[PDB]
Paper text:
Human ceruloplasmin (Cp) is a multi-functional copper-containing protein. Indeed, Cp oxidizes highly toxic ferrous ions to the ferric state for further incorporation into apo-transferrins, catalyzes Cu(I) oxidation and promotes the oxidation of biogenic amines (norepinephrine, serotonin) and synthetic amines (p-phenylenediamine (p-PD), o-dianisidine(o-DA)). The Cp molecule (∼132 kDa) consists of a single polypeptide chain with 1046 amino acid residues. Mpo (EC 1.11.1.7) is one of the major proteins of the antimicrobial system of mammalian neutrophils.
Author numbering:
A (entry chain A): 1 to 475, 483 to 1041
B (entry chain D): 113 to 578
C (entry chain B): 1 to 104
Amino acid sequence: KEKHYYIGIIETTWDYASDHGEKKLISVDTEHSNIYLQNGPDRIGRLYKKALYLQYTDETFRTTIEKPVWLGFLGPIIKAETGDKVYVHLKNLASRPYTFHSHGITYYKEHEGAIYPDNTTDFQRADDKVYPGEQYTYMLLATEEQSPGEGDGNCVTRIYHSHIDAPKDIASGLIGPLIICKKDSLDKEKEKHIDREFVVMFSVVDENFSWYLEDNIKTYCSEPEKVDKDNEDFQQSNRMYSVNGYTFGSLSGLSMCAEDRVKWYLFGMGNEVDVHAAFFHGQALTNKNYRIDTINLFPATLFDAYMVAQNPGEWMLSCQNLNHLKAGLQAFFQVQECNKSSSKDNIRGKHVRHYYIAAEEIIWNYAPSGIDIFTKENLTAPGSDSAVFFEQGTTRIGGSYKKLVYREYTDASFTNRKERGPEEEHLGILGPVIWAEVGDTIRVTFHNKGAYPLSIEPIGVRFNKNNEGTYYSPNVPPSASHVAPTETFTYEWTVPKEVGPTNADPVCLAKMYYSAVDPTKDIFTGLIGPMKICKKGSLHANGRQKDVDKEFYLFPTVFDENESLLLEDNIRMFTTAPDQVDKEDEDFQESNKMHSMNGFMYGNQPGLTMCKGDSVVWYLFSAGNEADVHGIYFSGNTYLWRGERRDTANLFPQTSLTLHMWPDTEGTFNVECLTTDHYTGGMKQKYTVNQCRRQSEDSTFYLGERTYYIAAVEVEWDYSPQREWEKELHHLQEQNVSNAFLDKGEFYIGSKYKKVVYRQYTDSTFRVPVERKAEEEHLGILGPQLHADVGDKVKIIFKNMATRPYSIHAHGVQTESSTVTPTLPGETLTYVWKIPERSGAGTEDSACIPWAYYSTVDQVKDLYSGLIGPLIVCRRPYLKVFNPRRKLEFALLFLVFDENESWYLDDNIKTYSDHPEKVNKDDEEFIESNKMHAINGRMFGNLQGLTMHVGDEVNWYLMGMGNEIDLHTVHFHGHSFQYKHRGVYSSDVFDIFPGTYQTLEMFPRTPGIWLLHCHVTDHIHAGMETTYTVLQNE
Amino acid sequence: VNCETSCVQQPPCFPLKIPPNDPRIKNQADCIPFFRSCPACPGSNITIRNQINALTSFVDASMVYGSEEPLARNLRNMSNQLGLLAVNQRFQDNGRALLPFDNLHDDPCLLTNRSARIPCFLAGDTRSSEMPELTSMHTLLLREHNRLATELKSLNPRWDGERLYQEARKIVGAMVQIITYRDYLPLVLGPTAMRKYLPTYRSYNDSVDPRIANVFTNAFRYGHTLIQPFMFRLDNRYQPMEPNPRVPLSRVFFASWRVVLEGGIDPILRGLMATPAKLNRQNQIAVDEIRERLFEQVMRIGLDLPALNMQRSRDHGLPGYNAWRRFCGLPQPETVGQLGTVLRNLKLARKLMEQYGTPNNIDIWMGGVSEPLKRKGRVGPLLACIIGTQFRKLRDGDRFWWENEGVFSMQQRQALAQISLPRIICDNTGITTVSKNNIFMSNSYPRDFVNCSTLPALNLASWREA
Amino acid sequence: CPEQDKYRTITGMCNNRRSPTLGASNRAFVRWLPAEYEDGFSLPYGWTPGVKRNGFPVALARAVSNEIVRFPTDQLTPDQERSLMFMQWGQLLDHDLDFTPEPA
Ligand code: HEM
Ligand SMILES: *[C@@H]1O[C@H](CO)[C@@H](O[C@@H]2O[C@H](CO)[C@@H](O[C@@H]3O[C@H](CO)[C@@H](O)[C@H](O)[C@@H]3O)[C@H](O)[C@H]2NC(C)=O)[C@H](O)[C@H]1NC(C)=O
Ligand SMILES: *[C@@H]1O[C@H](CO)[C@@H](O)[C@H](O)[C@H]1NC(C)=O
Ligand SMILES: *[C@@H]1O[C@H](CO)[C@@H](O)[C@H](O)[C@H]1NC(C)=O
Ligand SMILES: *[C@@H]1O[C@H](CO)[C@@H](O)[C@H](O)[C@H]1NC(C)=O
Ligand SMILES: *[C@@H]1O[C@H](CO)[C@@H](O)[C@H](O)[C@H]1NC(C)=O
Ligand SMILES: [Cu+2]
Ligand SMILES: [Cu+2]
Ligand SMILES: [Cu+2]
Ligand SMILES: [Cu+2]
Ligand SMILES: [Cu+2]
Ligand SMILES: [Cu+2]
């Protein structure tokens, strides 16, 4: 099919919450909508003049195609099949130049629609600039490289938007979805064997980043002289927590039937705070044929869903994000009787599992011992990291908190306890682990004894309309929504095969339950509990898995006691002067914020013991807000998740994953969250492996015995050696134009920093450094590409030429001990790096996978001082026994380098600053002036070396490290990639977080240089972007 | 030093030099690549260099299940409690199971056919993809495991994944043993050598060393003399399958794509059953497909299998022909006329004396395969002795031998005694007409063929726990 | 080794209870005759130029193959009493018994 849609950009008045009456929302307190929607002489209101994509019938733009009303402000539904030459006729009636730039569809430079430096003539720059009163024809093509992968379904999620200054057009509204699908999956533009198709876009669309924002204020605000644009509360009222624009559940037309085979294309967009967790209330969904409930959406993240409509009623599609959930990021939908016409299962009353939990209040000390175990430093050490949290004084509470939490009882009387054995010793702040098989019927007798009404919200089981924990609506006695301080309610959940794990998922899956009256506040009180829904014929009578040795439940999260209802109590009870307690102070809020793992901080969680030969099945889950971006790391051990082998697991509010592991190294290891402000913030722990199997001389398997020479050397690091890529970009955007990171001004540092990196030397002399060849020139700040093949023995003969102690160590690589010894100024040491099968790729991993080799002297500060490098652990017959191989290998580290958190800040303040006597490290403007947003350590199209040929196989190893604000959405222009063994999955916008390491296989064909960037507003504007050169044959 | 691209004789390489007037390799500066086997004790000035067995010596179907714990786990289906071995996640052979692929970095598969993009298979042993006929046997046994685990789930519902897998593993392992000892070994050794070296089993002897002798790694390579120069594919009526009924063997090595894209494993098993093997004759030892073009598609130069065998015995420091003769209580010819008498072939004795100068120096494989075959057997007296001795030790020194008491019950042993390879093919493929027992003798269609319906299937009754 | 076990271990360990590694994987082969090396303990025959074995020059493996193994394929004799499956069980069986590792 030659498809010809006629896109048109207009400038219309858009209603964010189109009423019309009358809603009560989850945790929303009525008189709170007006924070974002009410119009006065200071607030802009609910209506906003915005740029919008519209579909038209004719080359003559006079009559529009009506858009689905659930689609909101998004551009018209564009679909493309494998080999379809889809044309796009864009017209711009708007007052400013825009564009059409599309994801995951092949285009020539004459039809990209994304402006940025790219040594190209005018003819190939006409698409890049479409002014008012202009028309352009965008010739697109869905190729074999671009179409859905093997493991994908028939259709996959894609997008399109205007691309002069990426985010500022999107925030102005210009964002439309594309639905890329296989060659013959569609009939009448409708996917074969699909009842309904709905597009869902979660985006806290920030109107402060919109062009028209300026012309939005002249009209609706009664006083355009009393308003500052640098005003946080004015900036808060304009951030629109919106799924398709319609905020506070104002989203309409979402009408679906019973047994309706419904497809969901959900994608996230915005900025750093756009940390999304979508969930369908009492609905079962499937991704890549895996059972899920909570999706995680982030800027430009492309994701699809298949759900069989079940359990009729009027439900909720809410944002997990507890801050987003208290900002009306919700949407109602109806499943109706029409009536079926099939049932399936079936089994309401069968296997009856009965639990008798009860809520109660206690003194919960986070670090019971009173000592940070990692160093033996105590919690009240002067000035220290842990001091700020664990100080008890005038206005600081200390280590103890009053917290309502779940605890299980044996029977209906609630008089005597079911006691916690050695297994339940690790749970702590977590309540009882509730577990079920497929076919069972779970009944929970909840006896609340706390002075606030509560409930229980299970995630992973089906529950009827009158057994739901939370309340929400389009329109005494003890119920399900409300369980008063004195009351008792009996829940009744159903768990069939329509909500249970399918063939593709492992035996048990990680799930969770939490009180659902005000989950933005109830959870932070500690009313969270682990769940474990499992298949038919699996668990023993006691509850565990057959032939699985240990079962662990870790719930790493930032417990915000400020959000706790027991805030007023904890103030009165532990602080010396309760009168002086300032709730609206930013130093006080960070104290009650307690970065923990199961309610334990700094390594105090026990009960995490296992032997050398156990079948360890970790069940993880998380909660919280846009700060909860986790990277839970297991040192010296590798787990298997869905045939993907990692050591670092990623969590976001309401994520729940089941990791499988088997210990091989004896020792006291670490459960440290890689997130650099959580780690020093209190999210690091200890798990132990004993010896319960005779030693027995092993090491009979050494198919390789390599030796490498690394050195932590110091040189001046230039983040932008030439700022010439910066000017052309801004110029081509008409932009102006200040740079907070690079410009020097009066006292700031600029681009040049004295940093410490690894480098490759010839030998033991450390006199002749290895020369970095053209193919390996893309490394930048990163060290030499270490290659290890399953069965190798990698020798690192490290030297520390730096002036202070550093250390070399890898991710997931097997070592001898549980400790990495630091090396000193002048010293030489040898670090044995063993490469077993478990340190290699999994059956669903691409044979060449990356690991991050780092430093253990100060993994927070050394990281930001410049210690990072890629380890490439491949399979076996890859090496060619030589070197040069026709499989281009690129490694890219996506990290916001916090120059503040270096060992050489005070040396950067003295050497390069014009006026050092005017630098206060505690200024946010200067702290921002030193967070250089750089891939591989190079900003604003500075990263060279990226060059490949037409008809090449180009490997991309993407490494994620850093902080809470280090969520990075890696996007390639002009071409997509393919993940999963054999390249079964395909995507052009990937999710890279502090801890994730992934190979991406790209098959390029179009010649020319292409924009390579993260897709986060701030980060893009922070120069986190480069290019790659695909050249045509000789 | 890279042994694959360099002809320099430095560790861990030992390249085979090229003689003048070589029928193929014209450049005497060239060589056939060769990696010395891994030493048991690297860099020792004390130990005498010995080599490592990466597998369990026992006949326990380790080629199916693996011999190391990481692999053995990864070969199982951990997505349920059915006790299954993982199957391919992209392809099926007419709705029947294949092997889980392994990622294409640059494994030998993506080399046999570039555009097909079929990687090597993953099995209990790293060599399952070497020839498609071998692949077909791996696939066959993997199907039989999953079939046995299924039937055992219905017969014993209380059983979990572990119990099902172990019980199905215990069966497959016993089936490999029965076929090997009952059908295969008498046809290798002949009646006389069978009676001598493999007497009737009595019970398990804990004083019998079950380890594979270094020499067996070379001596059992007699099978290289049985290789036909083609892979033979036959259709459902056992007629040549078009358009490639006879694929030269140098185009099938590591050709995993032929299993996946060229009709599955049925035309292969049929071709194995209804085509004769090559006979080992004294002037017709081994075909040029393995002598001249071994692994031609997956490396820089065609290898010479017989020459590698000889280079390997030296690498392993194996004594010569006469030393093994003396070990076996066999007379040692010292002159050319004596070697002529022992080989019952003077012309070949001469060729050997021209090469080696004395019979003492003849490499074990060459001397072994040169000896005239025993009646109703396919090795000579020296190989018979080495091969025979090895399998007696593997039988008598296995605690889990299917006939050893307590391994199986009496009724289980009785039920197992009814298995056969033909029946396994009947139970796990789209093939409905198979060879008459003995499968290793029959090979003429339709003379030596019966229908699957005539063969009783295995009775799992005595496996009911009740 | 446990007192009781109905199933084999994967490694083969504990099959012999008196010597539990016998037959197990990743162990040195047994030697039925003492090893014959050019230096008597490691170096293979044909490693050092001019160094004879048992008083005679070591023949190149490739030359023995050319003069003794090589035959024209049109002279090939099909076994009238063995099938190609006889060849294939042999290889399958060998792979149940031994694999001799080399450096990658
Ligand atoms: C598709 C046909 C076959 C091919 C391509 C093949 C190829 C090979 C190769 C390349 C080696 C290693 C050579 C070296 O570098 O020293 C080898 C060794 C071996 N093969 Fe063959 N083989 C096949 C058939 C057979 C048969 C039919 C038998 C026995 C009935 C056999 C017995 C073995 C044994 C016992 C070894 C030594 C294995 C070890 O311990 O590592 N082969 N073969
Ligand atoms: C079970 O297996 C073991 C091993 O085959 C049998 O032991 C073997 O028995 C023979 C004869 O009794 C031993 O040979 C002897 O050598 C000595 C020392 O040179 C010599 O003095 C005698 O002339 C005799 O030839 C052989 O060493 C021995 N092997 C081992 C490993 O101990 C055993 O008898 C078998 N038992 C049963 C019940 O079948
Ligand atoms: C583009 O061409 C210009 C010269 O016209 C040159 O500055 C530059 O090398 C080219 N761009 C890149 C980064 O390859
Ligand atoms: C930590 O040190 C303080 C003094 O700085 C001391 O009072 C306290 O005992 C120490 N902490 C503990 C609980 O050991
Ligand atoms: C496991 O078994 C199920 C049911 O037979 C099958 O569909 C699935 O493909 C298997 N999984 C693997 C990884 O082989
Ligand atoms: C390789 O496989 C393809 C199928 O992908 C087939 O059509 C082609 O004949 C094969 N190539 C050769 C050289 O046999
Ligand atoms: Cu985009
Ligand atoms: Cu964290
Ligand atoms: Cu980024
Ligand atoms: Cu793009
Ligand atoms: Cu872009
Ligand atoms: Cu920033």
